[PDB]
Design an enzyme around this catalytic site. Structure first.
Site, PDB file in Angstrom:
ATOM      1  N   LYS A   1       0.866  -1.141  -0.031  1.00 39.04           N
ATOM      2  CA  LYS A   1       0.095  -0.098   0.109  1.00 39.04           C
ATOM      3  C   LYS A   1       0.872   1.416   0.020  1.00 39.04           C
ATOM      4  CE  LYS A   1      -3.754   0.198   2.745  1.00 39.04           C
ATOM      5  NZ  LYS A   1      -4.675   0.051   3.650  1.00 39.04           N
TER       6      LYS A   1
ATOM      7  N   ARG B   1      -4.691  -7.280 -11.898  1.00 45.73           N
ATOM      8  CA  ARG B   1      -5.288  -8.569 -12.356  1.00 45.73           C
ATOM      9  C   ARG B   1      -6.576  -8.114 -13.095  1.00 45.73           C
ATOM     10  NH1 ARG B   1      -9.259  -9.228  -8.468  1.00 45.73           N
ATOM     11  NH2 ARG B   1      -8.885  -8.378  -6.548  1.00 45.73           N
TER      12      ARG B   1
END
Ligand SMILES: O=CCCCC[C@@H]1SC[C@@H]2NC(=O)N[C@@H]21
Lengths: 35, 113, 112, 671, 91, 91
Positions: free
Chosen positions: D117, D293
């Site tokens: 993150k 993805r």
């Protein structure tokens, strides 16, 4: 007409019970000897 | 108890077998309730028994036997729900010819089962 | 309408007493015995109709007929306990004997 | 690079999804399977299929070595990872490259840079994409904690760093109350957890979630595909997704995508990516994360663009340039996606495993897409994800699409386990959802209306159930008649006819806890007169088959309707576009096991899981509600409680043991 | 019949790539010698807009020396030449 | 009873006779040994259109092929390749 529901025999044995463990072991040896 | 009874019958090891030839069923070509008007309740009046036959046999099909001999008696072959049947019905006073005609017909049905 | 009256057997008081003992009514027994939705050919519904001077015996105290049980045609002979407590009147014996004669001549299993 | 054979390093619906596109393109397909998946639809879908070991995914679908070994043995030039498992695994993507196998996805660098993150936010901020967020602070000085509370802006929440259940939590509405609330929270945390470390995490006002489908290539050209609303989530789990996101202007979305596109060019991302944004009530948006993805909810994007994103993934992994220019891309209509989950919404959305005894589905049209990896008789597995299927629709208008989905959901039938379908029907019919007033707290906020209790059935439904039972008996009679020599006997009819009287049948049906007495009269014409309480109904109908599903066509008091009829065990299932009703057939006592099981002692493990705590010694007196053991299953804590006040005879498991589902945990002394 | 050409040159456009392969009963081993025999089993790639099969024979038909032995003509369509070639081999 | 049946079957590939020993296992699978290598094979026949197809797993590798048995020849047509194997004819 053969759609009637009926009762069935048999009960689930106690696989953990010592008697069942011993009986299975003895009978299995006899079957292996037979084979 | 009623449930047990059904189980008992299922274990009779019985299967029905038919000795007679079978043909597909057909409804009569005329309504059955018309028998009310045709027959009525007065026994003194007379009606044609063929009308009764026409409203109960498969497809109202009927092969009459010795139609013009001993006409007071009606005999013939038909089928009800697919089963073969020989029908004997009164259409008047019994005569010598009628009795002979019936006796001949009954022998035919017995011979063919 | 006469059959409707015979359908009631002994009567309301007798029928209420019969059910109070946990028993099914005789005609309900037949309904549950035969295959679901199958026709039932009842015989001699009017046996005992006005046969006896002062005694009413609906159907002779017995219900007989041919129905299908487990796909097999059988003769069913059930006493009507609501009619005179199920006692056997002379017509009752004759009706039962007629049913047995029908069963034997046609090889129909008998359920009493 | 010519991709003539592809290995699909995944299972279930996503494996079937990839194989569909590969096969259309004339690309050969290789499946992998665990022992539990040997008979799965994707194994069949790919004539070439290889075993990768036992049912646990850590030993099968997550085994990089086995997947690479199968890719080598099958001579697959490329691996499609799908979604989940190895799709976001950097080591696996680098291993594919080392082995000369084309990974159909982003480069290992993009996977790693987005997987952390702090790293991903720093890259996104440098790329122009906003980085603002509310976060916890590990510093514990009262001055530092107060400065961070001001920066986050009031109101803020103080929480303890250790512990659960609301202990050591304080709400601070202004700067003046901060010190008192901090000291209150600390004292409670120190008392409860022996730790006075406090966290400072809050967000002042940004409700709603918006994401963007982005596509990149090896060349570095990048394009966006509008946006999707995934705000309707339960515990972060996405439940209903929509595209486009409602109330966002074409101009705003164009700007939203362009800032994300610059970041995509900055990491030269190759393959499909998704920029997740938090959007406020004023349509200001800030970068949250980038999923490296294909997203699960990519079908709503495909339905509004007319693209195949898996087809683009295969082409771009082969080295071809993006097929269409941004100018060529056009948007028509609106689309919705609902995820069918083997969950019990009434029991706090607990996942449920079990057989798909019935799995009827809505007929599929170009607008209606059934993304199903399971077939009737398939068993949902404890090891894998509980999703059963995903339903997506496209329509000219968003309101029309919502109507189509709800009609379609009713046609979907699932018997054998609990599902979220009725919850999705309530949610998609909620007034705020119809208005497009969605945010991430929508399910918590409207929980009372979305979870609906059962209501007593109408007498017409009971009449239909009785008619269905009678018709099933008639069908059984016909089946028996088929095998008899006396085919045309009048006894084989189901007329229920009597001489000079009418047959009346006393039937009993159970609706919920209520027994309903129905008096059915068999009429000569073939109809039925049913009396329930003081009301009489004229009922007539018949059974007809469409496909493999039996349908009941009935008319009650002149009202005609059609419904799907299923009679399983002692329950009658009636499925109609109005709704679904279950009616229970009473079980005769004699058939019920006489001497029914008594003095049951061991509550059975909710599932196969490690035993984390044992609170009972070999001989201990316990009262009902006394916790006996704590078990963790797939990261979900369950506490076993004492069924009876009986003393404990014995314990079958100790701490750290793995207990299989429905295995006895405690033995209680016979009393 | 006499009608004008249906499309103007501007309307005519080129899309993708297509390949046609003609199946023959000729045996390559005997220098492509034509063969006549019964077709006990005949099966083809599934028909679709991309894949078009043009054939004059059916399973159970017998090839005859009297006429040319070509079994069928197979046509496949795709965006680029290599992709069309891959489909042709698949078919 | 108490033993397992092993069938000795010979098939001919080209000019080479191959001997396969097939043991019919209780589970319904077949264990086949050719030379020194043992293979565990399980399979079923399913019909799509008018063509019978064989779905089979050998040593865990799964495949689908079209199976036609005509005369003394077994024909297996797969996406990868077509193999023809011969059944020896008794004297
Ligand atoms: O372990 C499986 C994934 C979910 C649990 C992992 C926990 S979440 C708190 C802590 N921080 C991490 O980054 N991982 C663990």
């Amino acid at each position: 007409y053969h759609g009637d529901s009926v009762a069935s025999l048999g009960t689930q044995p106690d696989l953990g019970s010592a008697l069942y463990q011993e009986n299975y072991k003895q009978m299995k040896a006899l079957v292996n000897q037979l084979h | 108890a009623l449930h047990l009874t059904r189980k008992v019958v299922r274990n009779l090891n019985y299967q029905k077998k038919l000795d007679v030839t079978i043909e597909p069923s057909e409804e009569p070509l005329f309504p059955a309730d018309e028998l009310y008007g045709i027959v009525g309740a007065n026994l003194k009046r007379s009606f044609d028994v063929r009308e009764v036959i026409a409203r109960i046999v498969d497809g109202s099909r009927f092969t009459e036997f010795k139609a013009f001999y001993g006409d007071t008696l009606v005999t013939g072959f038909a089928r009800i729900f697919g089963y073969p049947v020989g029908i004997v019905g009164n259409n008047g006073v019994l005569f010598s010819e009628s009795a002979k005609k019936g006796t001949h017909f009954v022998q035919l049905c017995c011979q063919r089962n | 309408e006469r059959v409707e009256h015979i359908k009631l057997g002994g009567g309301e008081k007798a029928r209420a007493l019969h059910i109070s003992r946990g028993k099914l009514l005789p005609r309900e027994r037949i309904d549950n015995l035969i295959d679901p939705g199958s026709p039932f050919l009842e015989l001699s519904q009017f046996a005992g109709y006005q046969l006896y001077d002062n005694e009413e015996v609906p159907g002779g105290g017995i219900i007989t007929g041919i129905g299908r049980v487990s796909g097999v045609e059988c003769m069913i002979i059930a006493n009507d306990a609501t009619v005179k407590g199920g006692a056997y009147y002379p017509v009752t014996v004759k009706k039962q004997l007629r049913a047995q004669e029908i069963a034997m001549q046609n090889r129909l299993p008998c359920i009493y | 690079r010519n991709i003539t054979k592809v290995l699909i390093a995944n299972r279930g619906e996503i494996a079937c999804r990839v194989m569909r596109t590969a096969k259309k393109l004339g690309v050969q397909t290789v499946a992998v399977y665990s022992e539990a998946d040997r008979n799965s639809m994707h194994v069949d879908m790919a004539d070439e299929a290889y075993s990768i070991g036992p049912a646990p995914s850590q030993q099968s679908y997550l085994s990089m070595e086995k997947i690479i070994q199968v890719a080598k043995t099958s001579a697959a030039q490329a691996i499609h990872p799908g979604c989940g498992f190895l799709s976001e695994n950097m080591e696996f993507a680098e291993l594919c490259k080392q082995e000369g196998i084309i990974f159909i996805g982003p480069p290992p660098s993009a996977i790693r840079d987005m997987g952390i993150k702090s790293t991903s936010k720093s890259i996104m901020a440098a790329a122009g994409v906003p980085v603002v967020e509310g976060y916890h602070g590990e510093d514990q000085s009262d001055q530092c904690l107060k400065e961070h509370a001001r920066r986050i802006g009031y109101p803020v929440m103080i929480k303890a760093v250790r512990g659960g259940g609301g202990k050591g939590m304080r709400i601070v509405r202004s700067e003046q109350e901060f010190q008192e609330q901090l000291e209150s929270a600390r004292r409670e945390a120190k008392k409860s957890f022996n730790d006075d470390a406090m966290l400072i995490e809050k967000f002042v006002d940004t409700p709603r979630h918006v994401e963007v489908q982005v596509f990149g290539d090896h060349h570095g050209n990048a394009v966006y595909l509008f946006e999707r609303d995934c705000s309707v989530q339960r515990r972060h789990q996405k439940i209903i997704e929509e595209a486009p996101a409602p109330g966002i202007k074409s101009e705003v979305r164009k700007k939203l995508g362009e800032a994300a596109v610059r970041a995509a060019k900055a990491v030269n991302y190759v393959g499909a990516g998704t920029v997740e944004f938090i959007m406020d009530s004023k349509h200001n948006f800030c970068f949250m994360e980038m999923n490296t993805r294909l997203q699960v909810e990519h079908p709503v994007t495909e339905m509004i663009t007319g693209t195949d994103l898996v087809e683009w993934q295969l082409r771009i992994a082969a080295g071809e340039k993006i097929p269409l220019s941004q100018e060529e891309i056009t948007l028509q209509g609106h689309a919705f996606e609902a995820r069918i989950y083997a969950e019990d919404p009434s029991n706090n959305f607990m996942p449920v495993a079990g057989p798909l005894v019935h799995l009827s589905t809505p007929r599929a049209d170009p607008s209606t897409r059934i993304e199903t990896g399971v077939r009737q008789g398939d068993e949902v597995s404890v090891h894998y994800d509980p999703m059963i299927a995903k339903l997506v629709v496209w329509a000219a208008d968003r309101q029309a699409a919502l109507t189509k989905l709800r009609y379609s959901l009713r046609q979907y039938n699932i018997v054998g386990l609990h599902t979220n379908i009725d919850f999705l029907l309530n949610l998609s019919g909620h007034p705020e959802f119809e208005a497009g007033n969605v945010h991430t707290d929508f399910i918590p906020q409207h929980h009372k209306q979305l979870l609906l209790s059962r209501k007593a059935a109408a007498k017409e439904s009971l009449c239909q159930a009785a008619l269905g039972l009678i018709l099933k008996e008639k069908a059984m009679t016909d089946t028996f008649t088929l095998q008899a020599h006396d085919q045309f006997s009048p006894f084989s009819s189901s007329s229920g006819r009597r001489l000079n009287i009418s047959y009346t049948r006393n039937m009993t049906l159970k609706d919920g806890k209520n027994n309903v007495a129905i008096a059915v009269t068999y009429n000569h014409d073939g109809s039925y007169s049913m009396q329930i309480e003081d009301k009489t109904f004229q009922v007539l109908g018949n059974l007809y088959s469409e496909g493999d599903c039996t349908y009941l066509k009935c008319s009650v008091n002149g009202v005609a309707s059609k419904a799907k009829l299923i009679i399983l065990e002692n329950t009658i299932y009636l499925f109609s576009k109005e709704g679904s009703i279950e009616i229970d057939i009473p079980v005769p006592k004699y058939l019920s096991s006489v001497s029914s099981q008594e003095t049951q002692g061991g509550p059975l493990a909710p599932m196969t899981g490690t035993i984390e705590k044992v609170f009972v010694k070999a001989g201990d007196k316990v009262k009902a509600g006394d916790s006996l053991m704590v078990m963790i299953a797939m990261k979900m804590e369950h506490t076993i409680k004492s069924p009876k006040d009986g003393t404990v005879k014995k314990v079958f498991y100790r701490e750290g043991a793995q207990a299989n589902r429905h295995t006895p945990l405690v033995e209680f002394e016979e009393e």
